[PDB]
């Protein structure tokens, strides 16, 4: 009506240990997420990796925490969970799975995942007697 | 059309719920009891059929708590717009203990992911 | 009608054109161009020998096939294909099963979904309610 602009991905640092999310190119699907702490993930184990940022997602999307391709193919790393709700205001955590035979070293400042703004519907739910 | 329609396929089903107006997914409930051993999989029936809104697919996604605490992951998870079968959740247990699912437990979430349905064209080479 | 076209090119004789199982199917089926043996608790990069050009306003998600997951404990790793990716489409397959998994040339290994996304600019604030 009166105002004409573009929605932004907003973030705030929760400590000095966080790194501002970055995008490699203009058409990259996601923003890089960086670990704020050191982690040693043993073989066949999981860790909750803290970024020490909180985000406010633009309306009409959720934030999907998605795997970095290189880490999957080379080190058998996968990302668990990964659904960041539009109204989530806490510390953004990344659930890393280490399926490899060797321990996996995460250092503060390492890129460990990517954040994609996935467009979704928020539909109302209706029970019917039967479907067709 | 525009809403998420569902029907129960037995009295053991639970209507999906959403915690927030801005929550990405509807929670899905197990209709049955399963014991999933370490390093094993199970298909968990919800006993509901769904009709997704036009222009999306239904992604069965992990609940965050179950992933972080219990090493539970969700396999498969692509529900097509035209799928009218019983909604089954493929759960992977990568934990070292057996994981218990009982009737009425929340085991996954359902997200309405907006997608394109593009036509496909073959070209000699791409730049 | 917008440029709602998925374009592809074959990089070798071994590639199969992606197919859709139904009109309202979420993804196009991706086929292996080669033979692979994936040992238990191991991964493999499975090449399709195709390059793709996604429509504007989406990325390509390489997503798992339901049957392979439920029956054989197969999963898909990585799987984010950027709009501007013009390389060979590789599928990272995880075999979490206790037996070896055989991928043959021409087997359906994954599906490609055009997930609609937004490309917001990033803004740092001191507090989330800053004006």
Swiss-Prot record, chain B:
Belongs to the dUTPase family. The gene is DUT. This is Deoxyuridine 5'-triphosphate nucleotidohydrolase, mitochondrial. The lineage of its organism: Eukaryota, Metazoa, Chordata, Craniata, Vertebrata. It is linked to Bone marrow failure and diabetes mellitus syndrome: A form of bone marrow failure syndrome, a heterogeneous group of life-threatening disorders characterized by hematopoietic defects in association with a range of variable extra-hematopoietic manifestations. BMFDMS is an autosomal recessive form characterized by various degrees of bone marrow failure, ranging from dyserythropoiesis to bone marrow aplasia, with onset in infancy or early childhood, and non-autoimmune insulin-dependent diabetes mellitus appearing in the first or second decades. Found in a variety of tissues. Isoform 3 expression is constitutive, while isoform 2 expression correlates with the onset of DNA replication (at protein level). Isoform 2 degradation coincides with the cessation of nuclear DNA replication (at protein level). It comes from the Eukaryota. One of its GO terms (cellular component) is nucleoplasm. One of its GO terms (biological process) is dUMP biosynthetic process. It is an enzyme of class 3 (hydrolase). Catalyzes the cleavage of 2'-deoxyuridine 5'-triphosphate (dUTP) into 2'-deoxyuridine 5'-monophosphate (dUMP) and inorganic pyrophosphate and through its action efficiently prevents uracil misincorporation into DNA and at the same time provides dUMP, the substrate for de novo thymidylate biosynthesis. Inhibits peroxisome proliferator-activated receptor (PPAR) activity by binding of its N-terminal to PPAR, preventing the latter's dimerization with retinoid X receptor. Essential for embryonic development. Its cofactor is Mg(2+).
């Amino acid at each position: 009506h009166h105002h004409h602009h573009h929605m932004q991905l907003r973030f705030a640092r929760l400590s000095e240990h966080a790194t501002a999310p970055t995008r490699g190119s203009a058409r990259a699907a996601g923003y890089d997420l960086y670990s704020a702490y050191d982690y040693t993930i043993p073989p066949m184990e999981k860790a909750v990796v803290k970024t020490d940022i909180q985000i406010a997602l633009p309306s009409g999307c959720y934030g999907r925490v998605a795997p970095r391709s290189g880490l999957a193919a080379k080190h058998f790393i996968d990302v668990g969970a990964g659904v960041i709700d539009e109204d989530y205001r806490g510390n953004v955590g990344v659930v890393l799975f280490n399926f490899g035979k060797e321990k996996f070293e995460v250092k503060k400042g390492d890129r460990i995942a990517q954040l994609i703004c996935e467009r979704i519907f928020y539909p109302e739910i209706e029970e019917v007697q039967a479907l067709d």
